[PDB]
Amino acid sequence: SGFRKMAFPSGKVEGCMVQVTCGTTTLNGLWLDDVVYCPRHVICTEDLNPNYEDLLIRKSNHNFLVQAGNVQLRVIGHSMQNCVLKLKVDTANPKTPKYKFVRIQPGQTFSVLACYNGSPSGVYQAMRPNFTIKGSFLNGSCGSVGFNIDDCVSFCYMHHMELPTGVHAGTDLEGNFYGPFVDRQTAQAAGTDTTITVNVLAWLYAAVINGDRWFLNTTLNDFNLVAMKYNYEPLTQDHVDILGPLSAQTGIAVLDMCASLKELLQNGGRTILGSALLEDEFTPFDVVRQCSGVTF
Amino acid sequence: SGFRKMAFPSGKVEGCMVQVTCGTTTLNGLWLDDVVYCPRHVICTMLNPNYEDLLIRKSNHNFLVQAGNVQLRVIGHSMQNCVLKLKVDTANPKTPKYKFVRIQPGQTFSVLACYNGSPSGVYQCAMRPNFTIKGSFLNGSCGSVGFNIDDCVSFCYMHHMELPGVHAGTDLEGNFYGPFVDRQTQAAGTDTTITVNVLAWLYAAVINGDRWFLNRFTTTLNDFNLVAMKYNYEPLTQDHVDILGPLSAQTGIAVLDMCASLKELLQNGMNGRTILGSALLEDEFTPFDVVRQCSGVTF
């Protein structure tokens, strides 16, 4: 029993972290087969408005110092795919897990292995609707990755920057930014964020599953009118079918839970799962995984 | 920037996790060198088990130890306090540098939750003052361990049981934390808040820009402690004050000043405001935890 914010076991990703060095700038990289992936701004020196194509031309393999623990690795080719730099090394990573690269959707969750100088510092478990993440990232963490595990690791996130507002932005493993952000040190606006409605519902189920039922007691269209006032993501029929298994195990219909949430937004000093705010960083899949103890 | 509850990277502990089966019972074990450690109730068919006389009826080959796909051969078995020790014929090639430590109430650690010898997830926990842990443990999780990392892994906790709904267990020598025993029958203490941790978390908040709670008062260790008692908070000691030094100097706020701010939050409540994204006072970060995260300690 009990319910915690749970990250995936991180060992399979630890053996993929490397230190990437270019000039003074060093950051974290991801060594998979014979390729090291890292943020392209590792080639940035005073360069606010980097012309990355121009900058990468001034650069040669020799200027790329990749360190895998102690041992250095030889760079034998380099390229830019959108905002990631791909450094072809001559040794395939022997600790390479089965993996895929994936682009997740707003509201889905993943584990971040926060890393500095190619070495793991900690791991924690959402992509916000506005495509930021509320993480814990210090200067030097660039290149840390987010991932889910299915024995196969789905890499979904590579950390690129700390925004002035204290939230963080990055790319999938093909270098496409999540959200409107660019890899320039300029002021950049994130959207209005919203609360992830189907995740809050999922967490209300985890609450019932763990014995916290006091919030129990509407219709889809009635609900979206109240949720829009409180800055909640609209709830779609897809979201309702996603919550189906939790409804089945609890015996509480999806639109009943939505009625419970309506009253919760209108009225508010009690706790739910020992929190005094509504949590939206648990997906329905997260709730099922933890409450039925999926292993890897 | 930002501040999360952060667990240690779990890979070194992942390579030590095994499955241990005895009759109808399967749980997790910790395999370091040529020894596997697991809860002794692995041999229980409970309510009031006579553990010595249940161990009598057991031989080495009654213990199935599985490491991934490999079967290990059990050449010895003994019981130390509430853990069972199983000698196997093959040292664990992946044994990290490790120590066994008994931690103190209010210290934190990472739990690698496990089923059938396989990991499910990792989360950061604190030993409550009543020596329970508010974990996430389903049936089968017994044997999962809690740890801190220094490249050395110090194991502090092994999961044993769910009380009627928090969690109880032992250090790696099999001594329970708290007054608990391994029978299905038990009242935990009164759970106080861990004051030095709440203080450190207020320091973390200040470091991250949340300063609205900073007040115009000071107080005294004794004046503060009187209020701590009233609100079921742990007494604050000079040792706690000295542990807060680095955070006091980094932020330039006297510990006793932070204490006065906390006194105002305890007496006036929070008024629907939040601190570091939480609308409660958090006490599962140690001063060390705050420092490691804010400075980026690696392993």
Ligand SMILES: *C(=O)c1ncc(Br)cc1OCc1ccc(Cl)c(Br)c1
């Ligand atoms: C990012 O975390 C990072 N990591 C290592 C080093 Br050395 C420097 C870093 O920040 C540089 C940086 C460049 C461009 C942007 Cl947009 C940001 Br935000 C940070």
Ligand SMILES: *C(=O)c1ncc(Br)cc1OCc1ccc(Cl)c(Br)c1
């Ligand atoms: C506990 O995690 C566990 N795991 C697998 C199996 Br099979 C049985 C388990 O516990 C049963 C049990 C024995 C003794 C106590 Cl004191 C408790 Br709670 C549970």
